[PDB]
Amino acid sequence: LDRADILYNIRQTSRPDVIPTQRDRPVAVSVSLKFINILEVNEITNEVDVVFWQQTTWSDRTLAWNSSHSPDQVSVPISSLWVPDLAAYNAISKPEVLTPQLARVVSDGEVLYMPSIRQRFSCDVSGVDTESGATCRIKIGSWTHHSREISVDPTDDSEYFSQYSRFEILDVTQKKNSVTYSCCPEAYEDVEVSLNFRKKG
Amino acid sequence: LDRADILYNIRQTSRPDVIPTQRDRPVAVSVSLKFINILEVNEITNEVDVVFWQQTTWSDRTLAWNSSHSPDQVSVPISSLWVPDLAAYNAISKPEVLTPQLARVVSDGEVLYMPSIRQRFSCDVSGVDTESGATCRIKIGSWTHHSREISVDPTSDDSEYFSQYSRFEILDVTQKKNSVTYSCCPEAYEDVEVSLNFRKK
Amino acid sequence: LDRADILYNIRQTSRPDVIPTQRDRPVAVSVSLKFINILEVNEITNEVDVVFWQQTTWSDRTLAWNSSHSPDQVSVPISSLWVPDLAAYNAISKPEVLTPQLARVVSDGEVLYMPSIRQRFSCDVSGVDTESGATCRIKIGSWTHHSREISVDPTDDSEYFSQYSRFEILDVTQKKNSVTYSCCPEAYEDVEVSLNFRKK
Amino acid sequence: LDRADILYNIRQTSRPDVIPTQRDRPVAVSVSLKFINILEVNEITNEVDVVFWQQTTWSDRTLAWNSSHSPDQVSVPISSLWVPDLAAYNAISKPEVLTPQLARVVSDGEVLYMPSIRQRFSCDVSGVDTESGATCRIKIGSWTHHSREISVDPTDDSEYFSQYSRFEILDVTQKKNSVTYSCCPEAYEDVEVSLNFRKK
Amino acid sequence: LDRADILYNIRQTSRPDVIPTQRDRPVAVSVSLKFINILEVNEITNEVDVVFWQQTTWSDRTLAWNSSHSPDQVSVPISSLWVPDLAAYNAISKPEVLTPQLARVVSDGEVLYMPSIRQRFSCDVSGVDTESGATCRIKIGSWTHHSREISVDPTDDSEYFSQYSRFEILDVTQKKNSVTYSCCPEAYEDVEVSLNFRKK
């Protein structure tokens, strides 16, 4: 097998429509936000404009191939793959994906998709111009798949943060939750990412 | 049947262009707005910028399958399904869908589609900064299907999912069903009017 | 025939690229604007931002079917049928269609397409804050089909106009024109819609 | 042949990806801008927002048909034919096409494509509020085809210019150029359109 | 072979999803930015709005053809070719491509793709209104292909800068880097382009 064969096979058979659950166990999705920039904060309206890399990993065995004498990994357009239907609950704009929409697939079926996203959120901006800073909580989970189909888990904080931002990051913490909504009888998991940041002073 | 079979079958046969009327009876569509945020309000121009989950349900029997030893539900891209052609009569921007465009289909043919939408409306903003608050009325119905093809009906805490970080707060949400004949066409068109009573904190 | 058959047949045969002229006579298109809102006006720049329902009707016999024991009408995505290439000559933004892009087809081939459109125009805004108001003229016609292929004709004023607009409509009148442009030897028809409005 | 046959044949065979050079001679493209509006001017940033009809003509013999007992012309979506890859060198926004994207094809293979375009440009705005006015130069040519593959030539100046603009046109002149860039060994032709205008 | 054959063959066989690595050696991509305009420099937020031609070259042997008695080059839509997945790490808007999305392919498989791009960046704007000027660093590299699959190298770049900009370019320098990120075990190459500019 070479890359052309692998990509041909994936394109013919991946079934992007089909969640790759194994034996009625949920697909375990890991999500981790690497913050790159904070662009346009408004303490009056409690809105924030943020740029982050959304590191997203999961397993899809239907993509796997025998890597004997073959490439161990390929880059695949996400339109040819099943991707988790993650949404940020407190987003107030649709995600603007700034990078090529390619995922990386390993021969055992492990997938990494890590777009750079600019998005606007509704969150607590109070204290942004103080030494304690503001804490903006971003909540991300599957929109349509309950906890028996998709589970979501969290995997330096300023590591890739732009030095040219007007803001600086004090801390980033994660928390996993499982919530039942009035609409539906089942539980839906999310990861809440708390971004503690402040204006440079 | 597993998920792959069900989704394959739906993709091959659903007919997204065909309204699934049963025996010349209208498709009964239920619509309910769960308000999440009020983002911009302008009392001079009478305009409002709102985020809401549009809970939309209907039945399409052509999607049904025998759920014996099979999954009870699948998530399906709306491009593979018939969806009611709902529109907001007083919208002044196109709906910005913030979430993955997937519907949930139950084995008996019941569909739920519940996108998070940000949209701007023309409505009565007067009184927003008073105790009584403003009442903004949002009118939603089928754009091209009359009352014998689509009926629309309203389906909890109004502020249930409303953001605590909004500058506004919700006092009350009420619904009302209407049937209207327009000058353009001889038939009647149903709508739901959702009255959002809100004020500045 | 049921709806599924009719829509299948339309999808397989409608020919959206082909103007449905009958016997070398023009396709008669009717256009009528129902103003819903006036959102922003600028008297210095002579620009206006308007929302309207563009009621558009024409006949396409290639869509017709025998309605005996069959539905009399279906809703069809406009991508599956021929639609007149109307443009507003004084638009300064592309039309933002706010509604599902569906037309309604009757079994005899009559088509109605009626999108809600938000669009910006260059027009006379002077007098908007006076009793007489401003008169903004919007000119609409086929971009590429001359008068022997497409004719355009006009069919309450503030019937659907929003009560919450800062503006109010005093009068709406229409006028049909036929114009020859320097670029091309033939005549092109348009409808000019005159919107007389003022600040409340 | 009727319109349906002609359009069917064009759709099946036109090859929109293939430049219709004849016998290793360049495709002769004519370009002419008819200015409709000037919407915003900035003398500090030297930027202008303009609306114009871009009259573009060329010949593509692969489109030709025998017009004996047949329509002489059809309107065709530009996605179904080859179109020159023209770009404005000093544009600072992408062209916003305001009109239906249809070209008109004559039976001998002559094509006219004439979209209404709104676009922003970087150019010399100095003098706009004086009697002499400003002269904004717009440079248009093929982006990827050199002079042996595409040649570009120019074909009342205020003829279609909006009376409601804050600006007025004093003169429009054209000039053809042929330029070698550092990137590539070959020459690339352009037309430079000089728009002399001023605030009323 | 004529142009129609070559383009037909490319469309049928190019495999736009497949990186054209040769013998487990990386595809060598060359990138060079030719700055055309600087449109907004926000001294509050450290954000710049820039227009540049992104000259991008690489080799794809699967595109090659025997050029004996045949055209030496064709223009090809990028949707029909593999293109490197380059991204600007400090971009804060998606790239707005202002030009026709065509690449030029030589019979030996050499590809040139050179779009005009408008994009907004986060970078050091301090000193823009001083004699030394500001230095804005733009970092560009493959998003998903590591150093054994794609290498990136720089090929002045201010020759095409608009004379009507409020800004002027003092110097442009490039630097190649190779970086390992926390997410992934391999190294990813980038080119960092330093744009030294100031207000006139």
Ligand SMILES: *[C@@H]1O[C@H](CO)[C@@H](O)[C@H](O)[C@H]1NC(C)=O
């Ligand atoms: C590929 O074939 C080898 C040799 O028999 C086998 O042991 C291995 O399990 C196969 N690889 C994968 C990934 O299954």
Ligand SMILES: C[C@H](CCOc1nccn1C)N(C)C
């Ligand atoms: C709160 C949201 C609302 C949307 O949910 C759904 N849409 C289709 C099926 N379901 C369940 N999720 C996370 C339940």
Ligand SMILES: C[C@H](CCOc1nccn1C)N(C)C
């Ligand atoms: C007011 C709107 C106008 C649009 O109507 C329609 N467009 C195509 C068919 N129909 C009927 N509806 C609800 C009648």
Ligand SMILES: C[C@H](CCOc1nccn1C)N(C)C
């Ligand atoms: C004013 C417009 C200009 C555009 O005309 C055309 N574009 C293609 C063919 N034609 C004729 N029409 C109505 C002549």
Ligand SMILES: C[C@H](CCOc1nccn1C)N(C)C
């Ligand atoms: C200056 C512009 C830059 C784009 O050029 C090209 N892109 C692909 C091939 N070529 C040649 N042209 C006109 C040379």
Ligand SMILES: C[C@H](CCOc1nccn1C)N(C)C
């Ligand atoms: C910083 C970026 C992040 C995205 O990387 C990737 N996305 C999918 C595979 N890979 C590797 N690269 C260059 C590592």
